[PDB]
Write a protein that binds this ligand. Structure first.
Ligand SMILES: [Zn+2]
Ligand SMILES: [Zn+2]
Lengths: 222, 213
């Protein structure tokens, strides 16, 4: 079976079709499973700033380059195109680290996540997680400072957002935007988050090992 | 707990007790296991005594020592089995709790299936934190296949006379077998298994890195 009953929106899909070129739609039509979407993001070059800005799905399809939220927004678009809600989840760190965004999806009542990253951490999640919490917690141990010895190995994840439904915005605002979508990032950051720790628990945390920081440092793209 | 500790003290040498006395937090225990050389197996199943003597351990050997150290400071000596398909080997950790939250001490040579901080609200939640990083990384044949299938209830070693495992000179294969036979909870059904996606090449490369050469 492949169908489009994932509680997205026929009306919403119609609005998307009005905005997209034939080429864009032909691509999105092929990306009919979460797995196919992740496979597609694997062929996109991970970004650098070798401007460096928060591109729309349109820009990403044109230039075949993406950082995490650019990847997740394209994924959410592709999920919506096949009848899922376009859902983002923010993973919120201390100010020592950058947040990471994934695109949530469900298959047979279980949560998965599509993720664009250059490192072997914060990757795709299979639809096997019984709750958003359970999925989010599967990231905690592998979210740490690996790029400097300053707080080397410190675990930096502090909270996860409720699923963030992009349906609330006019699709023009993000799908095909030419501006900076920093307002969208900001709206995500400002949405309901659930803390993972209290102060006591934070004091318990143990740094990741040297082998872990070395492993995390590996790069998919030069 | 106090009674159990007393029984352990009867069995242990002064040197062994001096070591266990130092390992007074789960974090200190993990730090200690980090100084023990990881194995690379003919196969063994050494007691905590043997492990302290030879300073060498595979995963269950590490977890049994951890459980001992936890018990010496009044925690239950709990193991959790992580059970894979036939394509992979199981992994064992020592569970612990601090302020109502589960953590895990783990002995491994690779940057996966590591220590877990006491932040997980249930055994299930902790176990699920291992799923994505349990995969075939050593061959191209089913490269990246995710192999974890079930986790055990906490396995309390209190059910056995401590003589039987703490200081045993025999093979503790019976203990491994008892663990493997205890209540397990499946993570997938057949439908979910069909959804699984292989880990990426970058992930298998990362998993292949070694702490001990
Ligand atoms: Zn479709
Ligand atoms: Zn954020």
């Amino acid at each position: 079976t492949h169908h489009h009953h994932h509680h997205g929106s026929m009306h919403y899909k119609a609005q998307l079709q009005k905005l997209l070129t034939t080429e864009e739609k032909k691509i999105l039509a092929r990306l009919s499973t979460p797995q196919k979407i992740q496979d597609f993001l694997d062929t996109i070059k991970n970004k650098d700033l070798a401007e460096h800005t928060m591109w729309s799905p349109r820009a990403v399809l044109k230039h075949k380059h993406a950082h995490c939220m650019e990847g997740a927004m394209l994924a959410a678009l592709a999920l919506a195109y096949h009848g899922h809600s376009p859902l983002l989840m923010d993973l919120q760190t201390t100010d020592e680290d950058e947040d990471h965004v994934v695109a949530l999806f469900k298959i047979d009542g279980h949560w998965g996540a599509i993720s664009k990253t250059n490192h072997p951490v914060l990757r795709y999640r299979d639809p096997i997680y019984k709750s958003v919490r359970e999925l989010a917690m599967s990231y905690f141990h592998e979210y740490f400072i690996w790029w400097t010895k300053k707080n080397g190995g410190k675990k930096t994840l502090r909270a996860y957002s409720n699923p963030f439904d992009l349906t609330r915005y006019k699709p023009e605002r993000w799908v095909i935007a030419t501006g900076d979508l920093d307002w969208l990032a900001e709206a995500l950051d400002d949405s309901k988050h659930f803390p993972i720790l209290n102060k006591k628990m934070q004091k318990q945390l143990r740094p990741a090992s040297r082998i872990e920081t070395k492993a995390a440092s590996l790069s998919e793209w030069p």
